[PDB]
Design an enzyme around this catalytic site. Structure first.
Site, PDB file in Angstrom:
ATOM      1  N   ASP A 181       0.829  -1.216   0.000  1.00 21.02           N
ATOM      2  CA  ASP A 181       0.000   0.000   0.000  1.00 21.02           C
ATOM      3  C   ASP A 181       0.865   1.268   0.000  1.00 21.02           C
ATOM      4  O   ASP A 181       0.513   2.268  -0.633  1.00 21.02           O
ATOM      5  CB  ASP A 181      -0.946   0.032   1.226  1.00 21.02           C
ATOM      6  CG  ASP A 181      -2.342  -0.598   0.973  1.00 21.02           C
ATOM      7  OD1 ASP A 181      -2.595  -1.254  -0.065  1.00 21.02           O
ATOM      8  OD2 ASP A 181      -3.229  -0.431   1.850  1.00 21.02           O
ATOM      9  N   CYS A 215      -2.302   0.588 -13.483  1.00 23.69           N
ATOM     10  CA  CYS A 215      -2.385   0.560 -12.028  1.00 23.69           C
ATOM     11  C   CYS A 215      -3.573   1.456 -11.687  1.00 23.69           C
ATOM     12  O   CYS A 215      -4.601   1.371 -12.358  1.00 23.69           O
ATOM     13  CB  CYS A 215      -1.049   0.990 -11.417  1.00 23.69           C
ATOM     14  SG  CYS A 215      -0.251   2.488 -12.205  1.00 23.69           S
ATOM     15  N   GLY A 218      -1.984   4.758 -13.913  1.00 26.34           N
ATOM     16  CA  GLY A 218      -1.300   4.313 -15.127  1.00 26.34           C
ATOM     17  C   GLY A 218       0.023   5.004 -15.432  1.00 26.34           C
ATOM     18  O   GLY A 218       0.385   5.124 -16.614  1.00 26.34           O
ATOM     19  N   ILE A 219       0.759   5.456 -14.403  1.00 29.13           N
ATOM     20  CA  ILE A 219       2.046   6.109 -14.632  1.00 29.13           C
ATOM     21  C   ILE A 219       3.133   5.626 -13.680  1.00 29.13           C
ATOM     22  O   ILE A 219       4.321   5.628 -14.035  1.00 29.13           O
ATOM     23  CB  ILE A 219       1.922   7.652 -14.576  1.00 29.13           C
ATOM     24  CG1 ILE A 219       1.422   8.149 -13.216  1.00 29.13           C
ATOM     25  CG2 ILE A 219       1.013   8.140 -15.682  1.00 29.13           C
ATOM     26  CD1 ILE A 219       1.412   9.696 -13.080  1.00 29.13           C
ATOM     27  N   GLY A 220       2.763   5.224 -12.462  1.00 26.92           N
ATOM     28  CA  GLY A 220       3.752   4.852 -11.464  1.00 26.92           C
ATOM     29  C   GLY A 220       4.268   3.419 -11.528  1.00 26.92           C
ATOM     30  O   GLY A 220       5.338   3.166 -12.106  1.00 26.92           O
ATOM     31  N   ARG A 221       3.559   2.479 -10.897  1.00 26.62           N
ATOM     32  CA  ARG A 221       3.869   1.051 -11.073  1.00 26.62           C
ATOM     33  C   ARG A 221       3.875   0.659 -12.555  1.00 26.62           C
ATOM     34  O   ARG A 221       4.698  -0.157 -12.998  1.00 26.62           O
ATOM     35  CB  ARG A 221       2.839   0.204 -10.314  1.00 26.62           C
ATOM     36  CG  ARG A 221       2.825   0.452  -8.807  1.00 26.62           C
ATOM     37  CD  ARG A 221       1.641  -0.221  -8.128  1.00 26.62           C
ATOM     38  NE  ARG A 221       1.377   0.407  -6.836  1.00 26.62           N
ATOM     39  CZ  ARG A 221       0.389   0.059  -6.008  1.00 26.62           C
ATOM     40  NH1 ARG A 221      -0.463  -0.904  -6.348  1.00 26.62           N
ATOM     41  NH2 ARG A 221       0.247   0.680  -4.839  1.00 26.62           N
ATOM     42  N   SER A 222       2.922   1.181 -13.319  1.00 29.45           N
ATOM     43  CA  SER A 222       2.873   0.876 -14.752  1.00 29.45           C
ATOM     44  C   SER A 222       4.164   1.303 -15.443  1.00 29.45           C
ATOM     45  O   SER A 222       4.691   0.589 -16.300  1.00 29.45           O
ATOM     46  CB  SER A 222       1.669   1.577 -15.390  1.00 29.45           C
ATOM     47  OG  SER A 222       0.413   1.071 -14.927  1.00 29.45           O
ATOM     48  N   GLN A 262       6.692   7.792 -10.413  1.00 27.93           N
ATOM     49  CA  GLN A 262       6.046   8.861  -9.644  1.00 27.93           C
ATOM     50  C   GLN A 262       6.858   9.347  -8.454  1.00 27.93           C
ATOM     51  O   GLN A 262       6.560  10.429  -7.931  1.00 27.93           O
ATOM     52  CB  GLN A 262       4.680   8.395  -9.104  1.00 27.93           C
ATOM     53  CG  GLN A 262       3.557   8.406 -10.102  1.00 27.93           C
ATOM     54  CD  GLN A 262       2.232   7.888  -9.486  1.00 27.93           C
ATOM     55  OE1 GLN A 262       2.078   6.705  -9.169  1.00 27.93           O
ATOM     56  NE2 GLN A 262       1.293   8.784  -9.305  1.00 27.93           N
TER      57      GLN A 262
END
Ligand SMILES: Cc1cc(C)nc(Nc2ccc(N)cc2)n1
Ligand SMILES: Cc1cc(C)nc(Nc2ccc(N)cc2)n1
Length: 282
Positions: A181, A215, A218-222, A262
């Site tokens: 988390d 995710c 759609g920018i960090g984990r992705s 991010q």
């Protein structure tokens, strides 16, 4: 510089935040006018995360062709990805329309439906074989075929039917269920194992449309997923693997979608994943 020793040099000097801010300063800025039209406000999850006009995926529809999704096309690596936000209650039908129209084989999901006590995306696939989903606005039917639950991820086989033509296709759903988390994983080992499972399925290969990865925004984990994949592919393709510059690859990807990676912790984790992954490849 090489990667593994540039890495230790940033750790010892504690300068990850400064490196990451340099990336943010140099990143491309392109217009996103279609995303900001008033008629599309309820198609965006976050007001500060929008696809660029030049690389946005268009739905094959004359009323409204907009979805918050971007085509990331990596020329040297010969890989393409569609990065998108977690679907909203009013965009689940658009999401599966895109999967169909773009001929994708796989969907990569890097978040849980609920995290930190709040909803991060809609329950957009069926949980029981006998309870299928119909999307009336886009005329698609979606059925769960099978589900394999493992300790760090789950793989599902899904059937997508275009109800207009009665054509059917098999879609693979690769769901990474254990990203914490807060923060990033302590070891990249389970994330790399997951990446290799997606690769082994054929979902990233040129005989299919681009994989869809998401995710919540759609920018960090992705971003971490496609950055690690592309960097490892280039290290296999080139005569000199130490010439792969992860910061330059990230800036190339940011020409196609804003905000990829991010936090400075996600940047460090991307370095770690590529470093450890390069040893296992050989
Ligand atoms: C007839 C009927 C009644 C109900 C309650 N659900 C469905 N299908 C369905 C399955 C999965 C999700 N996520 C949503 C809807 N279908
Ligand atoms: C058969 C069936 C039954 C029900 C209750 N829903 C669906 N489709 C659906 C569409 C959009 C959202 N958000 C959720 C579900 N389909």
């Amino acid at each position: 510089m090489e990667m593994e020793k540039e890495f230790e040099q940033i750790d010892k000097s504690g300068s990850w935040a400064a490196i990451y801010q340099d990336i943010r300063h140099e990143a491309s800025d392109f217009p996103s006018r279609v995303a900001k039209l008033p008629k599309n406000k309820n198609r965006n999850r976050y007001r500060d995360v929008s696809p660029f006009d030049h690389s946005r995926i268009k739905l094959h529809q004359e009323d409204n062709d907009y979805i918050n999704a971007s085509l990331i096309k990596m020329e040297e690596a010969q890989r393409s990805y569609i990065l998108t936000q977690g679907p909203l209650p009013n965009t689940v039908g658009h999401f599966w329309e895109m999967v169909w129209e773009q001929k994708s084989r796989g969907v990569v999901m890097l978040n849980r439906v609920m995290e930190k006590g709040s909803l991060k995306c809609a329950q957009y696939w069926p949980q029981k074989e006998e309870k299928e989903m119909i999307f009336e606005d886009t005329n698609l039917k979606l059925t769960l075929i099978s589900e394999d639950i493992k300790s760090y991820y789950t793989v599902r086989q899904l059937e997508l039917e275009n109800l207009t033509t009665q054509e059917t296709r098999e879609i693979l759903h690769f769901h990474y269920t254990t990203w914490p988390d807060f923060g990033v994983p302590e070891s990249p080992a389970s994330f790399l194992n997951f990446l290799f499972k997606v690769r082994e399925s054929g979902s990233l290969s040129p005989e299919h449309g681009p994989v869809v990865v998401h995710c919540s925004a759609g920018i960090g984990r992705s971003g971490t997923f496609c950055l690690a994949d592309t960097c490892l592919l280039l290290m296999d393709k080139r005569k000199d693997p130490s010439s792969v510059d992860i910061k330059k690859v990230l800036l190339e990807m940011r020409k196609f979608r804003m905000g990829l990676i991010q936090t400075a912790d996600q940047l460090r984790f991307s370095y770690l994943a590529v470093i450890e992954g390069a040893k296992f490849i050989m």
